[PDB]
Amino acid sequence: QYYGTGRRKSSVARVRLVPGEGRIVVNNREISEHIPSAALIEDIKQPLTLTETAGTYDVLVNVHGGGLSGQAGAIRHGIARALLEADPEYRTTLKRAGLLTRD
């Protein structure tokens, strides 16, 4: 059970990237159930599109703290961190993004 923490602007993404089909749970909710304004939904999968990991891992998270934008940012940051810790093969590619800001 790969684990990660998407710490960003007080919003922590307790992400556990386990092998699945591609489901993304946010505080026990659906993507559309939780986050309107899907402009950020496509952004969450930025690294998921840079590296081909479409539907092999599920994303179960308990995001505590922060607004909608900060929560989405923490979610994608934790996703990237957990994916890197799982398979660092594409770390050379993902080092050009990082997504670490200490905000």
Partner 1 sequence: KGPVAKRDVLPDPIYNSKLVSRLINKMMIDGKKGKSQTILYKSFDIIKERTGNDAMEVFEQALKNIMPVLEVKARRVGGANYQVPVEVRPERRTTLGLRWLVNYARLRGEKTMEERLANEILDAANNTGAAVKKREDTHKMAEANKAFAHY
Contacting residues toward partner 1, per CB under 8 A: 37, 39, 42-43, 46
Task: Give the shortest CB-96-to-partner 1 separation in angstroms.
Answer: 12
Q: Please say which residue, 43 or 87, places its beta carbon nearer to partner 1.
A: 43
Task: Give the shortest CB-43-to-partner 1 separation in angstroms.
Answer: 6
Q: Please say which residue, 93 or 101, places its beta carbon nearer to partner 1.
A: 101
Q: Please say which residue, 54 or 68, places its beta carbon nearer to partner 1.
A: 68
11 token code pair:
């919003």
Task: Give the shortest CB-69-to-partner 1 separation in angstroms.
Answer: 8
**Separation between Cα atoms, residue 59 and residue 48, nearest integer Å:** 12
